[PDB]
């Protein structure tokens, strides 16, 4: 019944979590030093990072919690999984502003070219990382059963962060994803020959955003602490770490080979 959905369901986000793994190794090792020059490669390199940290992160919690969390793998355990959600909220905030900074190319293109700070992605990318560390570790300061726990301040944070995400990430990026839309099929559709890769690209970026990343982010953050039945939470809760794996390992093959101008 529900037993053998969680454990292929479990399998199958094992297996797109190294597929991802490999591939954001692969788009990590083709961006080191070079191929910066290009304002889109800093946030591409930075996403494949924090993927690669969530991908691994579920690795070994999926590998953890099969064996029993008896003494010893309990503590590294809940560790790895707030380092999960970390990287998780991480990776959304930076497709956020992957969205945004492509909307922004386009809607402002002069500034873009010859009025952008050559470090403004730089400075966003560690601004976001110390607000995601600084949120999890609220989140990890009042949630977890060994730093310190509490059953009003931990759902008010939870609260808090899916506020944060469901009115500001989502809104932000799907507004400045069908700006783009918007601006380039009434600016450039009529004129030239129809861009029906930055169309195909756009929507399947936030179709992938939309009905992938999301899901874990609405379980943990929201349907937790709603009073629902067992043996339907499970299947949510795998559903959503599946939904996010897949989407977590078709990044860098969506943004980083989508957008591979440098290495044609
Ligand atoms: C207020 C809470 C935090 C909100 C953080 C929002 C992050 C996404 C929006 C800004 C990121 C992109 C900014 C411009 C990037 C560029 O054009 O290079
Ligand atoms: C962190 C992101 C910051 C984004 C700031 C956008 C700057 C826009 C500046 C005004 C538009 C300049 C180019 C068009 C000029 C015009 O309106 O005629
Ligand atoms: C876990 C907390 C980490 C906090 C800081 C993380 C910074 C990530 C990397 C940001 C900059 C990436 C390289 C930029 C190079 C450049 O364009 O000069
Ligand atoms: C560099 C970004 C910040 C990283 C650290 C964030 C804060 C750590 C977690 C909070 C610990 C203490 C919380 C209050 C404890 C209490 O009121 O008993």
């Known amino acids: 019944t529900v037993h053998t959905a969680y454990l292929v369901l479990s399998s199958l986000a094992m297996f797109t979590c190294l597929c991802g793994m490999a591939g954001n190794s692969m788009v990590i090792w083709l961006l080191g030093f070079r191929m910066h020059r290009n304002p889109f490669?800093?946030?591409?390199?930075?996403?494949?990072?924090?993927?690669?940290?969530?991908?691994?992160?579920?690795?070994?919690?999926?590998?953890?919690?099969?064996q029993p969390l008896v003494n010893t793998t309990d503590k590294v355990h809940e560790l790895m999984k707030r380092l999960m959600y970390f990287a998780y909220t991480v990776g959304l905030?930076?497709?956020?502003?992957?969205?945004?900074?492509?909307?922004?190319?386009?809607?402002?293109?002069?500034?873009?070219?010859?009025?952008?700070?050559?470090?403004?992605?730089?400075?966003?990318?560690?601004?976001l990382w110390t607000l995601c560390?600084?949120?999890?570790?609220?989140?990890?300061?009042?949630?977890?059963?060994?730093?310190?726990?509490?059953?009003?301040?931990?759902?008010?944070?939870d609260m808090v962060q899916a506020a944060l995400i469901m009115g500001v990430l989502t809104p932000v990026m799907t507004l400045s994803s069908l700006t783009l839309f918007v601006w380039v099929r009434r600016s450039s559709q009529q004129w030239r020959r129809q861009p029906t890769r930055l169309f195909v690209v756009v929507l399947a970026s936030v179709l992938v955003f939309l009905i992938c990343s999301?899901?874990?982010?609405?379980?943990?953050?929201?349907?937790?602490?709603?009073?629902?039945?067992?043996?339907?939470?499970?299947?949510?809760?795998?559903?959503?770490?599946?939904?996010?794996?897949?989407?977590?390992?078709?990044?860098?093959?969506?943004?980083?080979l989508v957008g591979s101008r440098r290495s044609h």
């Not at 300061?141 to 759902?155: G, M, Q, T, V």
């Not at 949510?236 to 990044?251: E, K, M």
């Open 133 to 157: 560390l600084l949120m999890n570790g609220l989140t990890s300061s009042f949630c977890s059963k060994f730093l310190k726990f509490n059953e009003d301040r931990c759902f008010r944070v």
């Open 41 to 66: 490669c800093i946030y591409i390199l930075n996403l494949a990072a924090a993927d690669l940290l969530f991908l691994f992160s579920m690795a070994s919690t999926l590998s953890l919690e099969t």
């Open 93 to 127: 905030s930076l497709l956020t502003a992957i969205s945004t900074q492509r909307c922004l190319s386009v809607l402002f293109p002069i500034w873009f070219k010859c009025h952008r700070p050559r470090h403004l992605s730089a400075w966003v990318c560690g601004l």
């Open 214 to 256: 999301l899901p874990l982010s609405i379980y943990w953050f929201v349907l937790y602490w709603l009073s629902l039945p067992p043996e339907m939470q499970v299947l949510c809760f795998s559903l959503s770490r599946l939904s996010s794996s897949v989407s977590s390992s078709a990044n860098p093959v969506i943004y980083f």
